[PDB]
């Protein structure tokens, strides 16, 4: 079956000093917010309270996730990721405004959830 290989690196470190990766499974692409809600990984952080989110429409920058090596199978920004978050390191997307695409999809996108409240920089490779 077509299984996209999310990694979902958590924001905080382990107390040992290594990151903890969870490697979620869910099929295809419908919304990244629905995948992170369904497969039980921590999207919102402190905004995970019930009325602390816009329930998927994009009117709040609360589902933001740093995505690295995520130029392969992803939709472009819907002028809401371009507007809610503006002065960012440009690898940050809204899970309720991004989508990893079609159900026939294989890929190794790795997503750092909660780019707010983190301490690592990921040392991104310079494109082009």
């Amino acid at each position: 079956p077509p299984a996209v290989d999310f990694a979902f690196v958590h924001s905080v470190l382990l107390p040992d000093g290594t990151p903890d990766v969870h490697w979620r499974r869910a099929n295809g692409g419908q919304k990244l917010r629905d995948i992170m809600l369904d497969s039980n990984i921590e999207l919102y952080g402190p905004y995970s309270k019930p009325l602390s989110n816009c329930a998927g429409v994009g009117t709040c920058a609360t589902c933001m996730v740093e995505i690295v090596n995520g130029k392969e199978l992803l939709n472009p920004r819907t002028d809401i990721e371009k507007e809610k978050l503006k002065r960012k390191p440009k690898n940050w997307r809204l899970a309720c405004q991004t989508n990893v695409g079609n159900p026939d999809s294989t890929g190794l996108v790795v997503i750092q959830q909660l780019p707010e409240w983190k301490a690592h920089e990921w040392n991104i490779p310079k494109n082009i």
């Binding site: 290989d5 990694a7 690196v9 924001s11 905080v12 470190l13 107390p15 040992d16 000093g17 290594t18 990151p19 990766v21 921590e42 952080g45 402190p46 309270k49 009325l51 690295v68 090596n69 294989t106 890929g107 190794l108 790795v110 909660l114 409240w117 983190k118 301490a119 690592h120 920089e121 990921w122 040392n123 991104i124 490779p125």
Partner: protein, 126 residues
């Protein structure tokens, strides 16, 4: 709340409301229930629960600050900075039919340090 708070005002409001017009009255009581709802929501989001900002699930600088030394002491490192792309978790895990496992992507999750502005003074009384 009648004994130790203010209730008799709203009691007189709804008492003067229900003998006036039936349209305005039950929606006023419904908004009173909503008012109790959001005010208790405000009180719970402010005072009841963990802090949501110094919470060790959330803040990475907090996890870097509490753990001044690791869990092994003098093992696994002299400390490690520049933790690399440990997708395989150093388990030498081989790949089945998939898109990619390794590539020309060499990105090390270089985390921040410890033992610097370590205190993070908790919110004391004014």
């Amino acid at each position: 709340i009648p004994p130790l708070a203010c209730f008799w005002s709203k009691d007189e409001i709804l008492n003067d409301s229900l003998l006036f017009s039936p349209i305005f009255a039950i929606i006023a009581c419904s908004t009173a229930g909503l008012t109790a709802f959001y005010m208790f929501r405000i009180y719970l989001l402010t005072f009841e629960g963990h802090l949501n900002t110094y919470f060790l699930n959330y803040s990475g600088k907090k996890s870097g600050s509490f753990y001044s030394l690791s869990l092994w002491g003098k093992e696994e490192e002299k400390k490690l900075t520049m933790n690399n792309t440990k997708r395989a978790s150093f388990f030498c895990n081989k790949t089945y039919k998939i898109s990619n496992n390794v590539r020309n992507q060499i990105f090390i999750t270089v985390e921040n340090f410890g033992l610097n502005t370590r205190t993070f003074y908790y919110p004391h009384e004014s």
